[PDB]
Amino acid sequence: PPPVRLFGVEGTYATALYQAAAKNSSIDAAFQSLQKVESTVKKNPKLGHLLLNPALSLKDRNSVIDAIVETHKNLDGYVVNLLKVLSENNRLGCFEKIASDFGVLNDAHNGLLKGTVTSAEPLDPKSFKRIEKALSASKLVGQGKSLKLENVVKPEIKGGLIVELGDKTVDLSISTKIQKLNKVLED
Amino acid sequence: SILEERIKGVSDEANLNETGRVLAVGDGIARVFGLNNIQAEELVEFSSGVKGMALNLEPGQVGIVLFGSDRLVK
Amino acid sequence: TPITGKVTAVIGAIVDVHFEQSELPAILNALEIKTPQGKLVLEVAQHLGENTVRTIAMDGTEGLVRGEKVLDTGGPISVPVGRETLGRIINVIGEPIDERGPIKSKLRKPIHAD
């Protein structure tokens, strides 16, 4: 079964798409074409991203597909069948959802892992690099995998850092420590 | 380009406030897609002549309860 | 009008048709599937959207191969009424079922009426 499962509808579409292109052994091709069709959809904002509104016909939906494969003739072919499927199931409206989902699945296959270093305010680039080095070095990143570490700004977390990746976290923050500290002196 | 033109060709051209196109109807309860300036509990005039108040504003489908017969709204 | 359609579903005795042509039979119109038995008269009861009516089906509903053509009569099932309608037993559809041969009639009137 394809590594990394995607629960629920729209990601069942992604799961299918990946495994279908995995047996064709043309996943990179799929990914590239998916980025391209998503991009030219996204870059056509009014009329063709804001006319993904759910109200179009069966026949009009088919013709939206025909315009999409008119827009560029470079598509994997599995993803040309996928366009048909989403139209046919008339769930075409969620288009980008499947795209994003295929992306999540894909870059897991590629090996890339994503992390997060939430903090109160943005932290140093020196800190970013030191943490990135450490985190990549650690056994947590198995290696043969990469870490796109993203600092995000969350004011709610007061100071510190929280490392997140692999649904495994180490939370050493002042807000979290303060919570536990306060609690212990209210006993 | 040609794609954008063909997309423009299939465009609804709905006002999406003050109008909407029926999307299922029967039993008495209809559902229109549109009508995005509808007041809650407003009276909405179906274009075959039925008038119906609208009692549920769902997250995409305004649910208009028909005050007439069903045999006039298609 | 010749609004052809196909039988999308046959769930119980409430068959649903999907009229491919954009014009859709109106609610309370009647449709005929020209069955091997004879005809089955069905009556449109909901529009389920995407040009799929859902029809209450009058006569027996066994044996409808999913995809068999339907054609739209164009109005509520119209019985035959008249002074010449007395002395008959008539089916739900309105055909003579007491084998007195065809019921001569002037006006056929829609079953539904306000």
Q: Is residue B47 part of a domain?
A: yes
* Domain boundaries, position B19: 12-74
- Residue A90 forms contact with C (CB below 8 Å): yes
Taking each continuous run of H as one helix and of E as one strand, the counts in chain C are 0, 8
Q: In angstroms, what CA-CA distances link A97 with A9, A16, A34, A52, C53?
A: 10, 14, 12, 12, 31
B30-33 long-range contacts, Cβ below 8 Å, gap at least 24? B30/B63, B30/B64, B30/B65, B30/B66, B30/B73, B31/B58, B31/B61, B31/B62, B31/B63, B31/B64, B32/B61, B32/B62, B32/B64, B33/A53, B33/A54, B33/A55, B33/B60, B33/B61, B33/B62
Q: Which token pair is A108?
A: 């897991």
Q: In angstroms, what CA-CA distances link A162 with A145, A166, A170, A176?
A: 21, 13, 6, 10
CB contact under 8 A, A63 and B3: no
Question: What is the rounded distance in angstroms from the CA atom of residue C36 to the CA atom of residue A146?
Answer: 67
Q: Is residue B4 part of a domain?
A: no
Q: Is residue B55 part of a domain?
A: yes
**Contact (CB, 8 A) for A95 and A10:** no
Task: Give the bridge partners for A115, in sequence order.
Answer: A165
- Residue A152 forms contact with C (CB below 8 Å): no
CB contact under 8 A, C22 and A57: yes
CB contact under 8 A, C51 and A90: no
CB contact under 8 A, A47 and B8: yes
Of all residues in chain C, the one with the smallest CA distance to B27 is: C46
Least Cα distance to C76 among C43, C53, C103 occurs for C43
Bridge-based pairing state of the strands A113-119 and A151-153: parallel
Query: Measured on CA atoms in the order A75, A78, A79, A80, is the torsion positive or negative?
Result: positive
Contacts of A64 (CB under 8 A, 6+ apart): A48, A51, A56, A87, A92, B7, B10
- Residue A127 forms contact with B (CB below 8 Å): no
CB contact under 8 A, B73 and C28: no
Contacts of C54 (CB under 8 A, 6+ apart): B26, C14, C16, C17, C44, C45, C46, C47, C48
* Domain boundaries, position C69: 1-76
Q: Which phi and psi (to 5°) does residue A67 adopt?
A: -70, -35
Q: Which phi and psi (to 5°) does residue C93 adopt?
A: -65, -50
Q: State which approach was used to obtain the coordinates.
A: cryo-EM
CATH code of the domain covering residue C44 = 2.40.10.170
CATH code of the domain covering residue B61 = 2.40.30.20
Least Cα distance to B42 among B69, B62, B70 occurs for B62
Q: Is residue B63 part of a domain?
A: yes
Which one of B2, B5, B6, B13 makes the best mutation probe of the A interface by having the most chain A beta carbons within 10 Å?
A: B6
Please give the tally of structural domains in chain B.
1
Q: Is residue B7 part of a domain?
A: no
Question: What is the rounded distance in angstroms from the CA atom of residue B2 to the CA atom of residue B4?
Answer: 5
* Maximum pairwise Cα distance, chain C: 45
Contacts of A23 (CB under 8 A, 6+ apart): none
A11-110 has which fold?
A: Peroxidase; domain 1 (1.10.520)
Q: Which of B24, B69, B70 sits opposite C49 (nearest CB)?
A: B24
- Report chain A residues whose CB lies below 8 A from the CB of B34: 55
**Contact (CB, 8 A) for A6 and A15:** yes
Q: Which phi and psi (to 5°) does residue A183 adopt?
A: -55, -40
Question: What is the rounded distance in angstroms from the CA atom of residue A175 to the CA atom of residue C64?
Answer: 68
